[PDB]
Design a binder for this molecule. Structure first.
Ligand SMILES: CCC[C@H](N)C(=O)O
Ligand SMILES: CCC[C@H](N)C(=O)O
Ligand SMILES: CCC[C@H](N)C(=O)O
Lengths: 321, 321, 321
């Protein structure tokens, strides 16, 4: 049914519900075999990964590097300071050299269009490691964490409070494909991309789910099963700190926020977390799935790499979504 | 008898003579099997190490990275410039993410208290890769090198001449547990930490060894079997270069120093070495064990990682200490 | 016949035609077994490589790191910012520590004399990863690419147009040993090193090949089978940009250049490429072997490491040179 080998993964907008579910199935399979059964599975033996990072990273860096190596492959960490890209060489040429020396590329960038150039010019899989526009592999870890917590996903309401950024765009490109509703609050002027919203509206209609965009945190939180936030000042946006601290007043997730949420509410934050978006009482709550979520960045990028580079079939029974 | 799996290694003060001897036994075992018998021993297969470095490193970096990989594990080199730590994220949160993505952490830091926070907040082993206060894994290599040279350790007198720094603190936290005496000379005002000295005095009493602190290089060198020094200006102390070059005049180790030492004297320096602390005649002497010492950083960090992460038992006969 | 194990590879001037042919034979063997037959060949299992880079690199970095790891070894990427070299430690001492912790070193430097110090002071193989004077491992990839394209090398004329730099010096140290002629055009004042030219003249005489140095691009291109260029402003020469852009006017390789070349002409450029030295019509021509050339950096550095560190014999039939 699903065929993912050789594909790029630039955004979850290019993937069906069935395809994203397959990647979560594979994540759960690799997690069960390796973390629980202690198996060594050299699925990426004799393969290598080029990791280009234009921005700081703790989770994406660590999960990708230890995950690729745990399956027997070699991860090569490449920064702007060490390679010729931008400085002495074009992206087209860098993309062709990477194609002949590595089996895939994970690139954390500013411009999504750089990932498109890389995908068009390389004949190997290009995986988005975060861009200004989308962060698809984060949402993989998020939905796996919620499937593990709730034992299914269909009908959950996700409540975003915060900026209309890359994380919210990736939730918008995927939530409805799992039959989940989305209620999202951002400050006025900080809404998600109009083009992304338009396509999320279509997905909601196709899947019979609700999509609500608002500027009120408590309207977004009302009846939500999952409260989700992120930093108000994303990487590359630090010049706007003053204006954003003023615009985002009233948007911190607290227990007041949770008081309005469904009784089984949990909390997610992609991390790194600052004190502004969420207080400590929620962040370190027993309902906070923040550190399980961060661990699942590893099992899900492992599943991405296995499905884009091999013909491995999951032995695990498919999870209930 | 000895049980080290799961422990942290922040300082040798937390380890008994028996425990540190076990780590040297394991170092000798892994050195014999791999360097001499040429065996491939994948003891850390399917494991990973997070290496956080806040300071420059050639020996700790290389020994840890090639040693962890030689046992089949994957080392991930993380600097301040690339990860979010300090900048966008707290140490508590970084410690919890590292716990779920790696099997241990080696961290070279400024503040020893950062290693304590890391050890309390992570559920995986934290190994000190050097701090301003201690450098325990260096002394492991030092005592293995001296056991190899002398065929035992008990009753040796170590003569430190130089600064009251992290290397001298690690010798103070361990020498007496091996039945070795310590005679150490520092400039006035540059003495070892009062708290460390107090605990070294107790260890000397418990083990019936001598501890002598002095400001005279020749009193420290008198009758010593091993002359030991290090840079007068440690990393993070470069603002004090002028004051230290003036305070440390007369503290260079030369053949005049060795003339007063025991007849079988040898020399150690943790490296990197500068011309100030020791002259070339001693540093490149046939009695200088500096490069054997630096090689043993690899076999001993391999033994640290194996004992904190596995249940491997040494096949080698225990060395005479 | 050929015995290369334990040798350094600082320049192709120290290698006979037979020895360089053996390295190309081994490159073709490892390429056939791994790229075509899909074999996993752990020839460097239990080995490590220290990679010291003083300059930016995409191809040398990637080919060396993924190639060393593809054969089961561990590559350790060391920059000036992270290790003590230059700053707190001498090259002699760094060379001795690297000898006891790694099995070989690849070093991309400014000064060729730093590679000589490293080779004299270390007891492990030192491989040149590019210096201001030579880039031997690039020419290995170049001649393998041309052997694959033409099915032999003897009698080919290589036509260099550009600067008298490290790439042209490596061609001068090797072309005649394969029975290939060299016609090279540089601007006046930008000629190859007098000492290198003198030795290339001797090699041409010993092998009965022609060597022509000129300042005219079309004289160099006339009847040449391979047009070769590189940047006019090498790394470390950016202060001379103004003077070089003026001196090199008229030296861009275009189809006018190729109109004068042999009918079977191809094009090489070591990369990174800029618009100045060659136009797009030649660079992206079907006759341009630029990206095959860049891929062969990987199979040839793999062969270098295997021949300097093991006793592996090629199973492949020797290529026709
Ligand atoms: C993982 C960090 C996500 C955040 N929105 C950013 O782009 O900085
Ligand atoms: C390994 C270097 C040791 C020195 N005391 C320092 O802290 O810089
Ligand atoms: C691989 C780059 C070669 C160029 N001549 C340089 O030295 O910068």
């Amino acid at each position: 049914k699903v065929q993912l080998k050789g594909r790029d993964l630039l955004t979850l907008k290019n993937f069906t519900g069935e395809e994203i579910k397959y990647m979560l199935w594979l994540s759960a399979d690799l997690k069960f075999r390796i973390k629980q059964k202690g198996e060594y599975l050299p699925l990426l033996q004799g393969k290598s990964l080029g990791m280009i990072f234009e921005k700081r990273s703790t989770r994406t860096r660590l999960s990708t590097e230890t995950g690729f190596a745990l399956l027997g492959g070699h991860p090569c960490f490449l920064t702007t300071q060490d390679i010729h890209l931008g400085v002495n060489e074009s992206l087209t040429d860098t993309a062709r050299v990477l194609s002949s020396m590595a089996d895939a590329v994970l690139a954390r960038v500013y411009k999504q269009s750089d990932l498109d150039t890389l995908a068009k010019e390389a004949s190997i899989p290009i995986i988005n490691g975060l861009s200004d526009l989308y962060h698809p592999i984060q949402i993989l870890a998020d939905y796996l964490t919620l499937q593990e917590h709730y034992s299914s996903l269909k009908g959950l309401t996700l409540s975003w409070i915060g900026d209309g950024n890359n994380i919210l765009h990736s939730i918008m490109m995927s939530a409805a494909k799992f039959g989940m509703h989305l209620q999202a609050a951002t400050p006025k002027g900080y809404e998600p991309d109009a083009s992304v919203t338009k396509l999320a509206e279509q997905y909601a209609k196709e899947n019979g789910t609700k999509l609500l965009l608002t500027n009120d945190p408590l309207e977004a939180a009302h009846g939500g099963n999952v409260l989700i936030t992120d930093t108000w000042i994303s990487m590359g946006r630090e010049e706007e700190k003053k204006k954003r601290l003023q615009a985002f007043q009233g948007y911190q997730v607290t227990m007041k926020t949770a008081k309005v949420a469904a009784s089984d509410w949990t909390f997610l934050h992609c991390l790194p977390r600052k004190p502004e978006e969420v207080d400590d009482e929620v962040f370190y709550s027993p309902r906070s799935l923040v550190f399980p979520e961060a661990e699942n960045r590893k099992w899900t990028i492992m599943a991405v790499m296995v499905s884009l580079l091999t013909d491995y079939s999951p032995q695990l029974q498919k999870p209930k979504f």
